[PDB]
Amino acid sequence: PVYSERGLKKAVKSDMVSMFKAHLIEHSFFLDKAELMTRGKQYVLTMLSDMLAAVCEDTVFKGVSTYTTASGQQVAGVLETTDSVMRRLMNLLGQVESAMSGPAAYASYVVRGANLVTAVSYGRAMRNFEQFMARIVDHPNALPSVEGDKAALADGHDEIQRTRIAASLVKIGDKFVAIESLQRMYNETQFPCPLNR
Amino acid sequence: ALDKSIVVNLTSRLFADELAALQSKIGSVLPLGDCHRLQNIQALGLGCVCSRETSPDYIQIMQYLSKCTLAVLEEVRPDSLRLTRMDPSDNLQIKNVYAPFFQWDSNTQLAVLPPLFSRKDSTIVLESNGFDIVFPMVVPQQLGHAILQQLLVYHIYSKISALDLYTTNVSFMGRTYRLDVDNTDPRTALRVLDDLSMYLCILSALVPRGCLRLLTALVRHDRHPLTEVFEGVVPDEVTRIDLDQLSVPDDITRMRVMFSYLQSLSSIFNLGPRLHVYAYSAETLAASCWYSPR
Amino acid sequence: EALLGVYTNVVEFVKFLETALAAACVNTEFKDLRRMIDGKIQFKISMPT
Amino acid sequence: IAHGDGRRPNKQRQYIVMKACNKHHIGAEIELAAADIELLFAEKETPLD
Amino acid sequence: NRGLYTLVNEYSARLAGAPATSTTDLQYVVVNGTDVFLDQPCHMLQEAY
Amino acid sequence: FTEYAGAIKTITSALQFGMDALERGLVDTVLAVKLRHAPPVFILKTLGD
Amino acid sequence: MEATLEQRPFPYLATEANLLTQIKESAADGLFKSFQLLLGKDAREGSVRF
Amino acid sequence: QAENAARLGRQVLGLLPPPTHRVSLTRGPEFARGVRDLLSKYAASTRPTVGSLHEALRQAPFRQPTYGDFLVYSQTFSPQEPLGTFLFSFKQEDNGSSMDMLLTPTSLFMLSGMEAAKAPQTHKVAGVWYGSGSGLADFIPNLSELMDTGEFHTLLTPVGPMVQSVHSTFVTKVTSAMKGVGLARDEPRAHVGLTLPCDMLVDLDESCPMREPAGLNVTIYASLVYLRVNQRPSMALTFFQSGKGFAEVVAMIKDHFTDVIRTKYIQLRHELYINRLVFGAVCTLGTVPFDSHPVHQSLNSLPVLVFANFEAACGPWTVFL
């Protein structure tokens, strides 16, 4: 947001246009430049933690505790590579915990109740009708508050019996990342990978 | 009901110099641009259009005057000016100060005009804030129209100079004066004088013959007080126009359009907004007026 | 065609006193700027020789 | 922000965002031999069958 | 010409105007889009190196 | 009532919209005080000796 | 039938994450389709009818 | 059943004009405790509430415009409306007892008889509202000769917006509005704004930064230009919108109607008729609030503007030239 105070006006746009390219021509194929440079192992670390901060984390389920690691910590997200890039990142960055926790079922949406009533006549319906109903039939004119809404926001995600899921983990800053490669599922079936590109 | 109070935030504490001029004019008129409670000083004075290092003309300034809202001072605290506004129908306390002093009464008739005599008298400069403040000037409308007369006349005679006792000294009975013309802008004064050709030569297109026949009877031997302008001699033109026989329904069609175009000449001699004052004390120098932008 | 997830923003309130910008402040409560004009702090700098 | 300058103050504001869905379909395929579906029902009784 | 975030929305999903092929003899025009994965920034940024 | 509660939920949030905007003016203008009495380093350092 | 926008007073729900970062620029410059501004007096609940 | 009429005792006795504030002296210094809306600055607190400012909104300014009840044929005034149009009042001779003729601006295009591409938008739309531009011309056989001497601009008293129209087979009741903000009918507490076709409006405000100040006022005008097309007399109408004062706009309208002055007055080299010399008139249609956004609309297509918070204020037909 350092550039976007005064909006996209005609000078702001081309100032952004000339700064794709100082970021393109330098930082393209960043892992390949890291060989012939002096520093290396730190210069890649300020490309992940570059990328990890650039993602807009507008997760509405940020209040929801879906994928925790062991000892109740937090999973930020998942980067997925080929195998040869997974060879590099496993060297520079460890496999620090290697066992995450998470649900092992789905979340059932069922049109039992008065949703079925609005389903038959009307070509539109709802979700969580009773939780939607008590806001108006019994409890209006109270504020939208967090503690009175976060527990009624999931429809499954406090109820599924969670279990251990074996995968690779890594720590950057504090945001834990899981690392995967999808070629075992694709180079057994003779279909090409989309990560290769 | 409605409120109005425009307090003016200011970035630097004033001196002891220019408080004493602003303490003197505790009630006056100065128009601003942004209609809110808080305001930067670079909008208060008129000098956004009339500064020193330009060549301002008093057409465009006066043209600028009819746009803005108008406002009245309450206090001068050494940081914060405190002002009150002028709604499109609202009574207030105006309290005149202005230095070529004219006398008012109750049931008088006012206007708002630019500083037309002495800017150095009418403007104080704010060297502790950079931006200067230019005051406007309130004048009764008989003299409020009389100043605009010679201004539209002077820009004509300045063009033919491509000497001064006749073309500048705006007269009232009792006091003549002197306009403030050395560096003006004769282009938007020319645009107003452009449009008079679009009336005055068209007012010459339907001139009634019987009314010209009357001046072949008035100034020859049947004279009057207000006809001394001709000084007893007919012009050359009226001997050339009145050869036709009169008939009434010719001039009936004529005088109806002469009735109409003179209604259009209001559009070129407009003042700013107008002030109809109903009560006026003489020793407090206060007044009472309902404002009407028009 | 149903309705799935109907969401808001909730904006919190960070006041001035709870920040620590106010180490560049001394926050006195005060009642009437609608009276007070200015302020005055006085000093004496006695210089030895 | 209430800021004490000559800028035009801004009123209360609002945005309304609506996101849609996108359908997807997956299509698999299975051969079955008609000799196989026959001998699911055969009345065999013999250890070759 | 259009809005500069549609220009970031559309850049990820919609393929461009007749790009290359690969695993071919010559640079033939693309004729099927079941498989071809590519993108190129030569359109989006409008230069040549 | 649920039209009446439509207004009272608006107007109290529209009331405290100012309190979420006035209190920034503390954080704004106190900073705007300190930004006006802040010479740079190259002016203060040469006078600091 | 394609789903289109309406301004009807749904009893909305209280999330946790902020959303305000890069908005006044964004939906004014084509972040998505079916955005709707309201400016002061328009930011209210509509007159329901049926 | 008086429980119905007990509601009538609420609404009527609550909705009255405020009485003249008058106190007899034997009560004493009590009169100023009946002075409420003269205050403005109310009581702020730490966390104020509806319960703390219900007094601050109980007071309210006293505003109501007055209406004009008309009786119209079902022929001049269309059965379809967008409910927020603009009106006139044609004025020839009081024949009927209550028999009034009205003109919408979309009608008055068809009454003129001008070119198509000079106003390309409404011409397709105003051909399905009415006939071939001759069903209305049968009502006035002077629409050639009203154009000659220049009397048509004298015979229009603008009214403003609409409020309601109950429509019958031949007779249409039109509840109009002057003087301000008409309360709506089919939606209670709503306020019927003014609507203009996007074709007929021509702005004067818009510029590139290149600076002009704000205010409270911006004023819709109403032009009316006598032109001559195909050696046949026919008027022309446009609109305006500029918060710029009467001395400026007359000097700016003439730049917009430059060529129309330039076409006609070449013809008067060989002839002159003093009834022909009048050119146009400008009325004042009232005031618009500052920086209220004209929201575009569409009707069967026809782009239609709107002005919230319009208040009406008529004026005279001052001739210009």
Tab-separated table of N, CA and C in Angstrom, chain H residues 249-303:
chain	number	residue	atom	x	y	z
H	249	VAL	N	-24.118	32.485	-16.880
H	249	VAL	CA	-24.676	31.422	-17.702
H	249	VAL	C	-25.206	31.986	-19.010
H	250	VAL	N	-25.767	33.198	-18.975
H	250	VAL	CA	-26.196	33.877	-20.196
H	250	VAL	C	-25.009	34.125	-21.117
H	251	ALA	N	-23.843	34.396	-20.547
H	251	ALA	CA	-22.636	34.485	-21.350
H	251	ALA	C	-22.088	33.123	-21.760
H	252	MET	N	-22.596	32.029	-21.195
H	252	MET	CA	-22.141	30.698	-21.570
H	252	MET	C	-23.129	29.948	-22.441
H	253	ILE	N	-24.420	30.273	-22.346
H	253	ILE	CA	-25.417	29.639	-23.200
H	253	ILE	C	-25.180	30.018	-24.651
H	254	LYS	N	-24.776	31.267	-24.890
H	254	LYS	CA	-24.584	31.759	-26.249
H	254	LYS	C	-23.452	31.040	-26.968
H	255	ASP	N	-22.479	30.519	-26.227
H	255	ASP	CA	-21.462	29.709	-26.873
H	255	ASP	C	-22.006	28.345	-27.264
H	256	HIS	N	-22.986	27.832	-26.524
H	256	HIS	CA	-23.565	26.539	-26.866
H	256	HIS	C	-24.488	26.641	-28.074
H	257	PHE	N	-25.269	27.710	-28.167
H	257	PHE	CA	-26.162	27.915	-29.303
H	257	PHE	C	-25.540	28.829	-30.337
H	258	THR	N	-24.236	28.690	-30.565
H	258	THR	CA	-23.537	29.552	-31.511
H	258	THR	C	-24.029	29.336	-32.934
H	259	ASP	N	-23.963	28.088	-33.415
H	259	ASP	CA	-24.281	27.784	-34.810
H	259	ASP	C	-25.747	28.018	-35.134
H	260	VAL	N	-26.628	27.832	-34.153
H	260	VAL	CA	-28.045	28.091	-34.362
H	260	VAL	C	-28.283	29.582	-34.571
H	261	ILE	N	-27.520	30.425	-33.876
H	261	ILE	CA	-27.502	31.841	-34.221
H	261	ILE	C	-26.863	32.037	-35.588
H	262	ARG	N	-25.832	31.249	-35.900
H	262	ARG	CA	-25.100	31.457	-37.142
H	262	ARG	C	-25.896	31.029	-38.363
H	263	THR	N	-26.728	29.995	-38.249
H	263	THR	CA	-27.492	29.546	-39.410
H	263	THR	C	-28.581	30.539	-39.779
H	264	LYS	N	-29.387	30.938	-38.797
H	264	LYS	CA	-30.599	31.697	-39.078
H	264	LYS	C	-30.293	33.108	-39.546
H	265	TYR	N	-29.340	33.766	-38.909
H	265	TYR	CA	-29.179	35.189	-39.151
H	265	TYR	C	-28.372	35.492	-40.405
H	266	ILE	N	-27.922	34.469	-41.136
H	266	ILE	CA	-27.464	34.692	-42.501
H	266	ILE	C	-28.648	35.039	-43.391
H	267	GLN	N	-29.812	34.436	-43.123
H	267	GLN	CA	-30.983	34.593	-43.979
H	267	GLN	C	-31.534	36.010	-43.980
H	268	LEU	N	-31.289	36.786	-42.925
H	268	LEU	CA	-31.860	38.122	-42.826
H	268	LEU	C	-31.062	39.192	-43.578
H	269	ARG	N	-30.192	38.809	-44.510
H	269	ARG	CA	-29.597	39.803	-45.394
H	269	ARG	C	-30.643	40.387	-46.336
H	270	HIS	N	-31.525	39.542	-46.869
H	270	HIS	CA	-32.494	39.972	-47.867
H	270	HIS	C	-33.840	40.370	-47.280
H	271	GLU	N	-34.073	40.126	-45.992
H	271	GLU	CA	-35.368	40.424	-45.398
H	271	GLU	C	-35.195	40.733	-43.920
H	272	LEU	N	-36.229	41.333	-43.344
H	272	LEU	CA	-36.252	41.633	-41.921
H	272	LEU	C	-37.706	41.676	-41.489
H	273	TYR	N	-38.017	40.958	-40.419
H	273	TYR	CA	-39.349	40.988	-39.840
H	273	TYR	C	-39.178	41.056	-38.339
H	274	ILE	N	-39.689	42.137	-37.750
H	274	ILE	CA	-39.369	42.506	-36.378
H	274	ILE	C	-39.920	41.488	-35.390
H	275	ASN	N	-40.969	40.765	-35.772
H	275	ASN	CA	-41.439	39.665	-34.944
H	275	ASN	C	-40.466	38.494	-34.909
H	276	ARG	N	-39.589	38.362	-35.908
H	276	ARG	CA	-38.648	37.247	-35.950
H	276	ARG	C	-37.419	37.452	-35.080
H	277	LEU	N	-37.146	38.674	-34.627
H	277	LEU	CA	-35.863	38.960	-33.993
H	277	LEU	C	-35.694	38.334	-32.615
H	278	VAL	N	-36.777	37.936	-31.952
H	278	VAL	CA	-36.638	37.330	-30.637
H	278	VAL	C	-36.094	35.919	-30.804
H	279	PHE	N	-35.233	35.505	-29.881
H	279	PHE	CA	-34.478	34.278	-30.066
H	279	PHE	C	-34.768	33.225	-29.013
H	280	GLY	N	-34.656	33.559	-27.736
H	280	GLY	CA	-34.815	32.529	-26.731
H	280	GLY	C	-35.213	33.111	-25.398
H	281	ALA	N	-35.483	32.213	-24.460
H	281	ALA	CA	-35.781	32.611	-23.099
H	281	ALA	C	-35.146	31.616	-22.150
H	282	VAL	N	-34.882	32.075	-20.935
H	282	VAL	CA	-34.374	31.222	-19.874
H	282	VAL	C	-35.276	31.395	-18.671
H	283	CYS	N	-35.832	30.297	-18.188
H	283	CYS	CA	-36.482	30.281	-16.894
H	283	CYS	C	-35.551	29.668	-15.863
H	284	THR	N	-35.919	29.834	-14.605
H	284	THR	CA	-35.228	29.192	-13.499
H	284	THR	C	-36.147	28.121	-12.940
H	285	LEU	N	-35.686	26.877	-12.932
H	285	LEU	CA	-36.540	25.778	-12.519
H	285	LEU	C	-36.343	25.376	-11.077
H	286	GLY	N	-35.471	26.041	-10.359
H	286	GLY	CA	-35.269	25.724	-8.968
H	286	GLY	C	-33.837	25.339	-8.690
H	287	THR	N	-33.627	24.818	-7.493
H	287	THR	CA	-32.295	24.563	-6.991
H	287	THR	C	-32.112	23.082	-6.725
H	288	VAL	N	-30.868	22.640	-6.861
H	288	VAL	CA	-30.436	21.268	-6.619
H	288	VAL	C	-29.394	21.373	-5.515
H	289	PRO	N	-29.321	20.427	-4.580
H	289	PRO	CA	-28.212	20.427	-3.625
H	289	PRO	C	-26.872	20.257	-4.313
H	290	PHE	N	-25.835	20.748	-3.649
H	290	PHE	CA	-24.490	20.529	-4.141
H	290	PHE	C	-24.109	19.065	-3.951
H	291	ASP	N	-23.223	18.602	-4.848
H	291	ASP	CA	-22.617	17.254	-4.982
H	291	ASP	C	-23.568	16.103	-4.631
H	292	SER	N	-24.754	16.164	-5.216
H	292	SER	CA	-25.671	15.039	-5.235
H	292	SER	C	-25.576	14.381	-6.601
H	293	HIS	N	-25.325	13.082	-6.608
H	293	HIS	CA	-24.964	12.391	-7.835
H	293	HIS	C	-26.204	12.071	-8.658
H	294	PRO	N	-26.282	12.514	-9.896
H	294	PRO	CA	-27.384	12.084	-10.759
H	294	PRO	C	-27.254	10.627	-11.178
H	295	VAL	N	-28.080	9.768	-10.591
H	295	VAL	CA	-28.001	8.332	-10.840
H	295	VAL	C	-28.712	8.015	-12.148
H	296	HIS	N	-28.003	7.369	-13.067
H	296	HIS	CA	-28.590	7.021	-14.350
H	296	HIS	C	-29.556	5.855	-14.208
H	297	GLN	N	-30.557	5.831	-15.083
H	297	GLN	CA	-31.526	4.744	-15.123
H	297	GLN	C	-31.732	4.284	-16.556
H	298	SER	N	-32.699	3.398	-16.774
H	298	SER	CA	-33.034	2.952	-18.114
H	298	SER	C	-34.484	2.498	-18.144
H	299	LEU	N	-35.198	2.899	-19.194
H	299	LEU	CA	-36.590	2.528	-19.401
H	299	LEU	C	-36.774	2.121	-20.854
H	300	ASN	N	-37.812	1.330	-21.119
H	300	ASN	CA	-38.009	0.773	-22.458
H	300	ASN	C	-38.401	1.812	-23.515
H	301	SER	N	-34.165	1.437	-25.466
H	301	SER	CA	-33.896	1.843	-24.094
H	301	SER	C	-33.837	3.359	-23.972
H	302	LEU	N	-34.081	3.863	-22.763
H	302	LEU	CA	-34.112	5.300	-22.535
H	302	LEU	C	-33.362	5.673	-21.266
H	303	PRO	N	-32.182	6.279	-21.378
H	303	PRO	CA	-31.418	6.662	-20.182
H	303	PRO	C	-32.019	7.888	-19.511
